[PDB]
Amino acid sequence: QSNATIELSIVIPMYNEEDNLEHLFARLLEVLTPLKITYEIICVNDGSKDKTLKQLIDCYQSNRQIKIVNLSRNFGKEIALSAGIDYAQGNAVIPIDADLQDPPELIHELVDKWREGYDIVYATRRSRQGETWVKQFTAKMFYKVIGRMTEIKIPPNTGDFRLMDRKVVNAIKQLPERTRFMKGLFAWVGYRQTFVLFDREPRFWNYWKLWNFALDGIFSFSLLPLKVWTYLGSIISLLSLAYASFLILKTITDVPGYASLMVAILFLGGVQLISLGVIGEYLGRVYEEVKARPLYLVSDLWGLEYLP
Amino acid sequence: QSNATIELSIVIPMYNEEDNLEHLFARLLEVLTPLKITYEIICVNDGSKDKTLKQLIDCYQSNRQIKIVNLSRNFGKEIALSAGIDYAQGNAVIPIDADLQDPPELIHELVDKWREGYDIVYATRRSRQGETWVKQFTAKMFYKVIGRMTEIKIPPNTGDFRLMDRKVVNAIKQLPERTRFMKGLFAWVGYRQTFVLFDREPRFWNYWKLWNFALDGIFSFSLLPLKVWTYLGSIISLLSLAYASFLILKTITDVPGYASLMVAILFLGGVQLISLGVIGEYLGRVYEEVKARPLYLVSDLWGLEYLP
Amino acid sequence: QSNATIELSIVIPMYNEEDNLEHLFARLLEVLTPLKITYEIICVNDGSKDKTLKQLIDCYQSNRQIKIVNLSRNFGKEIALSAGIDYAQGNAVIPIDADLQDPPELIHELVDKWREGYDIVYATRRSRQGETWVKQFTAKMFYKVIGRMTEIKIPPNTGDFRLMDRKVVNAIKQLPERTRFMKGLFAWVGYRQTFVLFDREPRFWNYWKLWNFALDGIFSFSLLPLKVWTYLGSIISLLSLAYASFLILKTITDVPGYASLMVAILFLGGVQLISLGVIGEYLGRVYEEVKARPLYLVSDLWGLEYLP
Amino acid sequence: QSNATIELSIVIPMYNEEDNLEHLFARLLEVLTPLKITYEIICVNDGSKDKTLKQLIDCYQSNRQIKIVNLSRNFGKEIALSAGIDYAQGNAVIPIDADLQDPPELIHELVDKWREGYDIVYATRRSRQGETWVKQFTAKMFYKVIGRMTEIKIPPNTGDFRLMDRKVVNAIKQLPERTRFMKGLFAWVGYRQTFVLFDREPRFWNYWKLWNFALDGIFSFSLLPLKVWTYLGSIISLLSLAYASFLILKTITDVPGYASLMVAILFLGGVQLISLGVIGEYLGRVYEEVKARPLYLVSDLWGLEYLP
């Protein structure tokens, strides 16, 4: 009997990953076979310029469980992962790196946690360890800032390695976004979520790129950087009128030219800052409208059918 | 004979509402039964972290009229209400609070008013009463400002407790919005509307949250905060040229350095304010386009079929 | 034999138009009957607060050719006209005012011009005449500005009275816009268009509203108000460096404090203006993208079928 | 046997092209016949005001392979090309100019390169030659700037003359854009692409229009002009506090009025520039979201079906 349904999906983005495919697939077949469930391996060749696609073709010819999504260009690891998740049909979707930095044997624990009733199972590293002190401090500050300014609780030490149930995968597909912060998106779609500790196996930064990623994470879920300027401009304006009133009082109790210039410069700056703050409020509203996030995400229903 | 049609829908958002469900449902069954019409109770469990969903399951197992929409996360009372209204199928939809702050026996008067021919029946409190003087003054000022700057007439003392006919519910579903001011939206979709006075039963503010809600209400229906800055910048620029011309006249009838600095600062500030005003005009246009409100909402038709 | 096709559609928006419906329909029946073609009258009751809808019901009960679209609220004359055009099914659509300011007997000339092969037939007044000199000057300046800054040639002295063929009506329905300048939209959708002169029959301004309408017309079809500021800021910056270099030359061939303040203020203003200009460019691009105008509008095809 | 499938499509935009249609079609029939494949000629009459459409009708009546798309207005060469590509159904689409500036006999080499396995075959001029030195320098600088600021590698000396496979045509149709930079779009959709050298046959600038085209190309694929201003404002602010601290140190080791004015002006300018930079970041995000580019473009698939 052919089940014709897939219980587990493994999404693996590739970029120049020859001489690693054999080890990858050997370890995965060693791990995914004792689970005794139907599975599929979605290898997303993300615009590699070397002999990576051909070995994927050779593997897929021999093995039915391997499926290949060949992106036209190099779109980036996150976009390749999103494409693989879009083309995955299993009940649970588990991203995996080609170099096998994250252990595959944690798939057993991920599946057990999922079967316990969780919809998201994060695979969080126990300790950063090999990361440099500068990287650790920057990551900690970034996560604290994300927690403070946003209403979203992104778990620490989380990578792409995780398990998403079919509900979460459908909800993520329900988010049309081009500037996506995947960590914040997964934490935004809040189902019953849990984490499993794992110690990265041994022997495993363009800070401009990390800064850009952090900027995307800040901007996609917080509008406060667009709201502060109204209050700052109002404060500066109020200080300007206070200074002008004090100068008038001094004149009656003449104003030097530099004092009048102070007053006018501060007032104009405050008015312009108020204008920028109002425009920033409207621009944040436009962003929230344009991102086209669903108003709500229903998890379970009693007595009703899921809306089209 | 099974009617297979629902005449009244009650949408109730929940958040940590145990030990209140029994009283809620007892009072509702006491009120909704003498109406002698088919009804349904849409309980929208809005991401409660305590034993609220389980009691809803127990109630729904015993009672067919109770339907549960379990949101994945805590999306907020307004979003839970919107989800319940989306999942309601009755001719009239009546939001209800779990704590029963608003009397359920007003549902009879709401239904009578609806049967009199109205499409929206507001349930307005006769007098704020227990509200503090600061809250009363802030609410009054907010409503006067809303009336002045917008073309929309939001009735005073209105909460979520109200009746929406199927026409109004469909029209509200026809408004794709993520930054929604529900009061302003309901007043924007203008059908035959009326109000019923009720005195809240006895024993029934994070001013930052109220300020944010007021800001959303101001920004979603008025663009004047984006239009003022053009006029302000033009006025400031005109004052700058007036001052410069007066200084030139004084020179011919030398200009001190502070006077030239005044002229240049004022002119640059006015030009920048004009630029900000033009950008604000275009941004307000972008907001109105992006909010994707329908051009018109047809209420009744003679001799024609409703367009797809 | 029932044709089951409508050859001409008359769209008439109404707002407090009692005691004029009888004269309206008498004149229309006097005009539309000698044409010997099937027609329909779409009366769009635009949220009138008096006894206008009831007389429309009485007329529609007696006459099959009268169809009523009753808007829920007062959306404005332009929006009511758009709704009536959306609900019209004739080959040619002719807007008409309720007070009969524009003669109905011009419908004969409009139909003749349409049958000559034109897709848009404007009904332009021969001379403004009764309009005040201020109104004439403002209208002329507005039309000259529209012609200069836009690539669109809006014919002068054009009102809502006109004929749109089914091709033009479909193309206009293909323009999803909430901030619509109907004159500019009709001139933007450029088919074979012509005009017919007519002298308004005898006995037939909130300048803030006219200013807002003009602002919408300017902003919906021109982006130059968002492009100028880059050039202005660059010019101001270049002047600032020129002044600073001249001051340095004077020092070597000390700079007074006011001169350094001039230099810094001008440079900062120019840099901020360049930033505003770049943001305005991107905002104009966002507007053009968001307005969702079709890339092209195909008029006639040979050897191919019209794309879905 | 009728193939009922088209192997090659030629898209030719027209604008006042009489007395050239006969030579055009003679040369094309001379070139496209030895290919021994089914073809079609899509002539997109782009709002010509002279006797161009009628000759196209006469040609299409005699020849079945000629198909005419008559645009309502003059939308521009790029938009007419896009419309023709939208209405083309061949496996390969080859844009062609009416004046035959680009040789038609290069279609043979384009087809050979396509049959070799490439999805895009650029037709690049070997040397600009007749172009003026100013034009050559401006084009070279523009292409270097495009390469530097964008991640996209637009090949040099490329015009509209090229071959797009059906995959690339479908991907381009998958890009809903109103402000389109076709060169950057084709380079953005990155398939297996190649180029063929050709020396333009003998006897074959409104710099404002070239500047606008360059501005569109810069703005549609780069957001850095919206990102720089945050860093510039932060630098200016830091300089302002440095100057203020140095002045305080000088006072303790009084500040002249011009020094305090320097400090305040620089600080306000830096704060406003930071606000403009944040707004520019959010506006670039809004642009990337609104342009509605697909997240990824899948080229080939193994073991899976193409998603709807």
Ligand SMILES: O=c1ccn([C@@H]2O[C@H](COP(=O)(O)OP(=O)(O)O[C@H]3O[C@H](CO)[C@@H](O)[C@H](O)[C@H]3O)[C@@H](O)[C@H]2O)c(=O)[nH]1
């Ligand atoms: O453009 C692409 C397309 C696909 N992948 C795939 O993504 C997987 C893992 O990528 P990798 O770069 O090895 O991530 P990590 O091993 O977790 O470590 C990274 O840690 C930093 C940020 O996580 C990166 O800047 C470093 O390049 C990299 O060492 C692999 O299967 C790759 O093939 C990329 O990395 N980049």
Ligand SMILES: O=c1ccn([C@@H]2O[C@H](COP(=O)(O)OP(=O)(O)O[C@H]3O[C@H](CO)[C@@H](O)[C@H](O)[C@H]3O)[C@@H](O)[C@H]2O)c(=O)[nH]1
């Ligand atoms: O995140 C959520 C999800 C659902 N609900 C439901 O909303 C209903 C009523 O909410 P409630 O907070 O009790 O509103 P009120 O009783 O009308 O009074 C409110 O008045 C203020 C603004 O109306 C709020 O800030 C106060 O928290 C609250 O006392 C209840 O069924 C709740 O379960 C919430 O309130 N918050």
Ligand SMILES: O=c1ccn([C@@H]2O[C@H](COP(=O)(O)OP(=O)(O)O[C@H]3O[C@H](CO)[C@@H](O)[C@H](O)[C@H]3O)[C@@H](O)[C@H]2O)c(=O)[nH]1
């Ligand atoms: O909100 C609405 C809804 C519908 N209509 C209909 O529009 C038609 C004609 O409107 P009308 O105001 O009479 O336009 P005009 O007769 O052409 O003259 C106008 O000229 C100015 C701008 O055209 C307006 O400001 C003046 O109110 C008005 O006299 C009539 O059938 C009205 O019923 C409105 O005018 N306003």
Ligand SMILES: O=c1ccn([C@@H]2O[C@H](COP(=O)(O)OP(=O)(O)O[C@H]3O[C@H](CO)[C@@H](O)[C@H](O)[C@H]3O)[C@@H](O)[C@H]2O)c(=O)[nH]1
């Ligand atoms: O509005 C339109 C509609 C269609 N076409 C068609 O486009 C084709 C080629 O256009 P053309 O202007 O001749 O381009 P080139 O021959 O490559 O040279 C151009 O080089 C510059 C930019 O490429 C232009 O500014 C010059 O007008 C023009 O000489 C022809 O079939 C035209 O009919 C236009 O050019 N403009």
Ligand SMILES: [Mg+2]
């Ligand atoms: Mg790695």
Ligand SMILES: [Mg+2]
């Ligand atoms: Mg309460």
Ligand SMILES: [Mg+2]
């Ligand atoms: Mg009138």
Ligand SMILES: [Mg+2]
């Ligand atoms: Mg040419």
